[PDB]
Amino acid sequence: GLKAAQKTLFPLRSIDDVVRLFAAELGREEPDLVLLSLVLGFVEHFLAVNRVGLTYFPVADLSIIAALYARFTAQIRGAVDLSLYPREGGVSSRELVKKVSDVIWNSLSRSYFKDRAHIQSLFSFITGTKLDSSGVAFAVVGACQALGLRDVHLALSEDHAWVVFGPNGEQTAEVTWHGKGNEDRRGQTVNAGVAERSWLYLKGSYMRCDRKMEVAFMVCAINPSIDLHTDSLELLQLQQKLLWLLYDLGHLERYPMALGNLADLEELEPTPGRPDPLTLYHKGIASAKTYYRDEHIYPYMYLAGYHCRNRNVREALQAWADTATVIQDYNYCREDEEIYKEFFEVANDVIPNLLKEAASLLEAGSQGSALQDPECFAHLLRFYDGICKWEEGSPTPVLHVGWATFLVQSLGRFEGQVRQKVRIVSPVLTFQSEKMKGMKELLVATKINSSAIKLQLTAQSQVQMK
Ligand SMILES: CNc1nc(NC2CCN(Cc3ccc4c(cc(C#N)n4C[C@]45C[C@](NC=O)(C4)C5)c3C)CC2)c2cc(CC(F)(F)F)sc2n1
């Protein structure tokens, strides 16, 4: 509106007052995305971007928030003439979605760093004319809500955002850019990306938000970071309390990564009487299995990262094996580089460092070490197997020799007597990838044949002539 009922809690003087506003909006037929994003962006600005003069909490006065809200609605309503886009059947047209996208896009500053922190909210859009990639998609949805377009909703993969709209909510439209140096596809469907089985479009198992999930998205989008070394405790608390509010209302049920975010916040500062982080990570994985065909990678990464921080090598390896079992059924496509980077860093930095410490602890007499557990060797092998299977049939390759030395080193952290205990069948493990099937006979030698492993992992045809 803003409607009278939306104004009664102002001024917001504390974290808890912001939570009360979110609770009130989430109890309405349609929570007001523009109001909520402006409030979060205002408090984030004064808690993380500029803390000069902060004494407790940046009071959000109604006059200030209402003026920002009016700037947004005036910009959208003045620029989008709905009479040019008649709404057949109470649903929106592709041309109307494209117009809203164009209005947001054309408002942005001509040159700025797109990966900056704190450019996600409508506060940033209004005051700085800057948005990050997914911020543009959220702003399009908020503008559509402000215009009365109840069918336009945010769609989210694990690395991109777009909109759904139209009859039955069945149309898709790109509304923002993805990554750096890719060609704009605004206004097009996501069908080519779904059909090519890229990770970017999740084989179609992406999130189709309702309004409550769009509120969850903006809460996950809070960025508490003040600088590289410092987070705002106030914004961490706000994000944590808002995620618990959403959790209790059922609005995280279909949002795996939000459950992982909540688990990470609980690990940092547990809330008495709430579930443990592990329970929450497992709920995020359950959500992905239940609603998204177990086609998401990050729920397992969140779990693996917790185990890795807790130096629980066995369960970290299991969770990484599970990430690879998801990725194996994708084709590695152009624009999937973010997930390639995660696997590369896990394989070639994180696992090596974890196993190096495990080896030192084993030398010092550790008992029950992952390095003496053949099931942990099997998890390592299953991790590589899924990456090799991912590569099969893909338009771009995954493995190269820069992976091969780390594989040889990690395999060799397990003594041959441990490695011998895994039965590879066509502790028991079955390989899905042809690369790992051919590597089987190299996996039990006391001194692994490093050159042969490298040949098998990279499918290198030849050794040096001379
Ligand atoms: C909360 N809601 C939420 N979150 C989203 N993305 C989150 C994805 C996970 N990251 C953290 C992160 C990043 C890498 C990690 C782990 C855990 C592990 C593990 N193991 N790794 C791999 C590592 C270990 C490494 N190296 C040294 O340690 C990092 C390699 C973790 C938790 C934070 C953002 C998105 C994206 C959307 C699409 C958009 F809208 F944006 F278009 S919607 C949306 N919603």
Swiss-Prot record:
Keywords: Chromatin regulator, Disease variant, DNA-binding, Nucleus, Phosphoprotein, Repressor, Transcription, Transcription regulation. Changing residue 263 to P: In parathyroid tumor. One of its GO terms (biological process) is T-helper 2 cell differentiation. Changing residue 155 to P: In MEN1; loss of JUND-binding. Changing residue 21 to R: In MEN1; no effect on histone methylation; almost no effect on JUND-binding; no repression of JUND transactivation. GO terms for molecular function: chromatin binding; double-stranded DNA binding; four-way junction DNA binding; phosphoprotein binding; protein-macromolecule adaptor activity; R-SMAD binding; transcription cis-regulatory region binding; Y-form DNA binding. Changing residue 257 to W: Loss of interaction with KMT2A and JUND. Pfam families: Menin. Its main location: nucleus. InterPro entries: Menin. Changing residue 221 to V: In MEN1; almost complete loss of histone methylation; loss of JUND-binding; no repression of JUND transactivation; reduced interaction with KMT2A. Changing residue 430 to S: In adrenal adenoma; somatic. It comes from the Eukaryota. It is found in: Nucleus. Transmembrane segments: none annotated. Ubiquitous. One of its GO terms (cellular component) is cytosol. Changing residue 345 to A: Reduced interaction with KMT2A. Changing residue 264 to R: Reduced interaction with KMT2A. Changing residue 162 to R: In MEN1 and parathyroid tumor. Residues 193-365 are annotated as: Interaction with FANCD2. Component of the MLL-HCF complex, at least composed of KMT2A/MLL1, MEN1, ASH2L, RBBP5, DPY30, WDR5, HCFC1 and HCFC2. Component of the menin-associated histone methyltransferase complex, at least composed of KMT2B/MLL4, MEN1, ASH2L, RBBP5, DPY30 and WDR5. Interacts with POLR2B. Interacts with POLR2A phosphorylated at 'Ser-5', but not with the unphosphorylated, nor 'Ser-2' phosphorylated POLR2A forms. Interacts with FANCD2 and DBF4. Interacts with JUND (via MBM motif); inhibits the interaction of JUND with MAPK10 and the phosphorylation of JUND by MAP kinases MAPK8 and MAPK10. It is linked to Familial multiple endocrine neoplasia type I: Autosomal dominant disorder characterized by tumors of the parathyroid glands, gastro-intestinal endocrine tissue, the anterior pituitary and other tissues. Cutaneous lesions and nervous-tissue tumors can exist. Prognosis in MEN1 patients is related to hormonal hypersecretion by tumors, such as hypergastrinemia causing severe peptic ulcer disease (Zollinger-Ellison syndrome, ZES), primary hyperparathyroidism, and acute forms of hyperinsulinemia. This is Menin.
